Amino acid sequence: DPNMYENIDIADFNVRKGEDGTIKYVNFKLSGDDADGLLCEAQNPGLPSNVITCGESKYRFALSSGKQYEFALSLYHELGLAVGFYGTGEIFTHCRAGGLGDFICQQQNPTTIVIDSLPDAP
Numbered sequence: 198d199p200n201m202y203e204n205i206d207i208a209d210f211n212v213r214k215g216e217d218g219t220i221k222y223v224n225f226k227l228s229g230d231d232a233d234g235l236l237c238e239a240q241n242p243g244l245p246s247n248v249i250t251c252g253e254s255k256y257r258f259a260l261s262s263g264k265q266y267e268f269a270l271s272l273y274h275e276l277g278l279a280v281g282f283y284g285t286g287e288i289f290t291h292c293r294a295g296g297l298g299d300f301i302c303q304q305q306n307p308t309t310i311v312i313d314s315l316p317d318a319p
């Protein structure tokens with residue numbers, strides 16, 4: 198963690214929720230050591246979602262419920278190694294009306310999530 202890691206910048210994180218609370222769509226732009234404003238997106242991802250690949254890249258993500266904020270992101274980067282980079286962070290969102298009952302919950306400030314080759318802290 199302190200020495201071998203990758204800073205992932207998340208921007209424009211956006212989630213559309215139905216009146217249901219079901220996730221209709223999730224969208225964000227990822228920047229890292231090998232990405233600049235890479236689109237990560239999913240329609241009907243589930244909560245928690247499966248691991249989803251960003252475009253054609255070696256970056257992937259999963260969406261889950263946070264503990265401080267509503268949404269948490271898990272991020273993955275395949276390195277061509279037997280181990281990969283992984284990390285999780287919560288993203289503050291402000292929710293607005295999305296039309297016909299929907300919510301659109303939107304990140305207000307870019308945030309950084311650190312990923313590395315260690316698993317989750319206990």
Ligand SMILES: [Ca+2]
Binds near residue numbers: 313317
């Ligand atoms: Ca990690």
Ligand SMILES: [Cl-]
Binds near residue numbers: 283284285313315316
């Ligand atoms: Cl971790």
